[PDB]
Write a protein that binds this ligand. Structure first.
Ligand SMILES: *C(=O)[C@@H]([C@@H]1NC(C(=O)O)=C(S[C@@H]2CN[C@H](CNS(N)(=O)=O)C2)[C@@H]1C)[C@@H](C)O
Length: 245
């Protein structure tokens, strides 16, 4: 195809520039990683995974029978940070709404010891969860790089993680966020508001009509009065610019 890589690089940098943030999107094609955006050096820097960890929390919870995909986690009736969270949901609904109370309950069912062992076993990020089973993904000590995140998405997309195949398919079904003319986008968003500066994530893959999977991971700095939806907007623009969707 005819567009220069100079032009692709410049167009993708501009999407980050126009959102007035600093960020990177890593794309993996087969075994080859490509890094785009306006702060390339973020690629191998460690950030908290924030809600991207829901993906692994779900794998672990499901593998270890801490929940089923149809179980309804009841709202306890206490005020939640966001009103969309004050309702009863499955893991899948909770994943789409990035509902931390559901995933905090799941983590507590799993428990500190099984959680530390499982995160070590899958080798996620720096693999350190500390001593608090319900908050290690927001504010430390667990960290991961944008490169390690596309490599996780690539593992999940191909069923290579060390979990039952059915566990992995179950979670993957939870992650479908967009269909764009025959392509399907599976991804999990992330927003660490605790840490300073804030981190935004969108990690996932595109499944093309012909079955090919192209993993990506977007990582940027969120600032106050950014809508969470630039994460998606920058991502879809980047994938469209590259002819992936
Ligand atoms: C985890 O990162 C964090 C969740 N995650 C998100 C998120 O959007 O990734 C939120 S923001 C909350 C849920 N989505 C609503 C906004 N929609 S959008 N399209 O982003 O504008 C509000 C929340 C901080 C957990 C750990 O708190």
């Amino acid at each position: 195809m005819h567009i220069s890589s100079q032009q692709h690089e410049k167009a993708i940098k501009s999407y980050f520039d126009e959102a007035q943030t600093q960020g990177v999107i890593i794309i993996k094609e087969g075994k080859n990683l490509s890094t785009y955006g306006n702060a390339l050096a973020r690629a191998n820097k460690e950030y908290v995974p924030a809600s991207t960890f829901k993906m692994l929390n779900a794998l672990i919870g499901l593998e270890n029978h801490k929940a089923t995909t149809n179980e309804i986690f009841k709202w306890d009736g206490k005020k939640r940070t966001y009103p969309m969270w004050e309702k009863d949901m499955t893991l899948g609904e909770a994943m789409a709404l990035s509902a931390d109370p559901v995933y905090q309950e799941l983590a507590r069912r799993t428990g500190l010891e099984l959680m530390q062992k499982e995160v070590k076993r899958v080798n996620f990020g720096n693999t350190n969860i500390g001593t608090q089973v319900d908050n290690f993904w927001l504010v430390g000590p667990l960290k991961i790089t944008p490169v390690q995140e596309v490599n996780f998405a690539d593992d999940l997309a191909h069923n290579r993680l060390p979990f039952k195949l059915e566990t992995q398919e179950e979670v993957k079904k939870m992650l479908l966020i967009k269909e764009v003319n025959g392509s399907k986008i599976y991804a999990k968003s992330g927003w660490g508001m605790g840490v300073t500066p804030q981190v935004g994530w969108l990690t996932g893959w595109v499944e093309q009509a012909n079955g090919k999977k192209i993993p990506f991971s977007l990582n940027l700095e969120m600032k106050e009065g950014m809508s969470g939806s630039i994460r998606n907007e920058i991502t879809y623009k980047s994938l469209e610019n590259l002819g992936i969707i």
